[PDB]
Design an enzyme around this catalytic site. Structure first.
Site, PDB file in Angstrom:
ATOM      1  N   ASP A   1       0.730  -0.641   0.331  1.00  0.00           N
ATOM      2  CA  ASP A   1      -0.014   0.156   0.364  1.00  0.00           C
ATOM      3  C   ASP A   1       1.061   1.180   0.031  1.00  0.00           C
ATOM      4  OD1 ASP A   1      -1.995   1.310   0.177  1.00  0.00           O
ATOM      5  OD2 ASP A   1      -2.746   1.321   2.228  1.00  0.00           O
TER       6      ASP A   1
ATOM      7  N   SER B   1      -1.172  15.712 -11.726  1.00  0.00           N
ATOM      8  CA  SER B   1      -1.271  15.299 -13.504  1.00  0.00           C
ATOM      9  C   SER B   1      -1.548  16.195 -14.260  1.00  0.00           C
ATOM     10  CB  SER B   1      -2.456  14.117 -13.619  1.00  0.00           C
ATOM     11  OG  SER B   1      -2.640  13.955 -14.945  1.00  0.00           O
TER      12      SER B   1
END
Length: 330
Positions: free
Chosen positions: A35, A199
């Site tokens: 994770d 992004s």
């Protein structure tokens, strides 16, 4: 040194991925959920409340000759999906794919929430976010990656998750055969303890690319892609009959649909998520309403590039002094 381990979906929907991890001496192999959005390595154990164990493999520290109680240490964690676990702490030898760390903090669960109990295939979590998020008290502990870092050939690990198929986590090297083209690297902020990056935009299907900054985290422990409501609405508007359902808890679509792809930007590069990766199947057995793999982050408080996005790429988690993230197509 290096390590290389195969990671395997837990079910036919890729709800999560498990990777075998050797703990203790002799080795006890547990299948852990790696994770990158948390920083605790915790396991089902011989100390876990019996009624809360249902099929998991447990770690038994009393059977490991290298286990030592970390005296006075406790831990307690709550995840974004509302699940939780807590317990005490041992140090022991932990190996992943041939890479060994001695003295790793292994957090032994005394209590786990129902979601963990009900998932027989996940024996615990191995956190790979920054150690500043580790919950051990009163002495915070380091992640497996942080402990291994100095010994690694290069201070990196990579995630290469499969779509409906196994993939690979590598430590200490970049497998140049595992991706196509070049790796585009992008800046990381560690301010919130995550692999947080920005992004450069998105496209829906064959549509034009929208240049827009989307701050989010690369999180292998989250199944879906969670993005701003504007972006998500633009995606699902291209699917006839798709709608947001408050009763179901997100966007659903007719199972008869063909889903468009979703592209996200990494600098000037583009990662394309095929439409099929966005299908999470019937909402309940036999239903013709299917659950979407792209969902709104509104009210999560952060955008999350979970498995839906990451499995479309070869992803480099660069833990150099100034960390960065790399993405390649594959």
């Amino acid at each position: 040194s290096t390590g290389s381990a195969t990671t395997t979906p837990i079910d036919s929907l890729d709800d999560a991925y498990i990777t075998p991890v050797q703990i203790g001496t002799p080795a006890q192999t547990l299948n852990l959920d790696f994770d990158t959005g948390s920083s605790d390595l915790w396991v089902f154990s011989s100390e876990t409340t019996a009624s809360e164990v249902d099929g998991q493999t447990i770690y038994t520290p009393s059977k490991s000759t290298t286990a030592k109680l970390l005296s006075g240490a406790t831990w307690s964690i709550s995840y974004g999906d509302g699940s939780s676990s807590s317990g005490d702490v041992y140090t022991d030898t932990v190996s992943v794919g041939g890479l060994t760390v001695t003295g790793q903090a292994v957090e032994s669960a005394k209590k786990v929430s129902s979601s963990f109990t009900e998932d027989s295939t996940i024996d615990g979590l191995l956190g790979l976010a920054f150690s500043t998020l580790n919950t051990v008290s009163p002495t915070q502990q380091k992640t497996f990656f942080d402990n291994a870092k100095a010994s690694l050939d290069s201070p990196v690990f990579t995630a290469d998750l499969g779509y409906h198929a196994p993939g690979t986590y590598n430590f200490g090297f970049i497998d140049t055969t595992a991706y196509t083209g070049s790796i585009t690297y992008t800046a990381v902020s560690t301010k919130q303890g995550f692999w947080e990056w920005t992004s450069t935009g998105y496209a829906v299907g064959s549509g034009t690319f929208k240049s827009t900054s989307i701050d989010g985290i690369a999180d292998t422990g989250t199944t879906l892609l969670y993005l701003p409501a504007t972006v998500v609405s633009a995606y699902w508007a291209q699917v006839s009959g798709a709608k947001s359902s408050s009763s179901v808890g997100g966007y659903v679509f007719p199972c008869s649909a063909t889903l468009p792809s979703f592209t996200f930007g990494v600098g000037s590069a583009r990662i394309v998520i095929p439409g099929d990766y966005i299908d999470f199947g019937p909402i309940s057995t036999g239903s013709s309403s299917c659950f979407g793999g792209i969902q709104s982050s509104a009210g999560i408080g952060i955008n999350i590039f979970g498995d839906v996005a990451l499995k479309a790429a070869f992803v480099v988690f660069n833990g150099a002094t100034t960390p960065t993230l790399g993405f390649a197509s594959k």
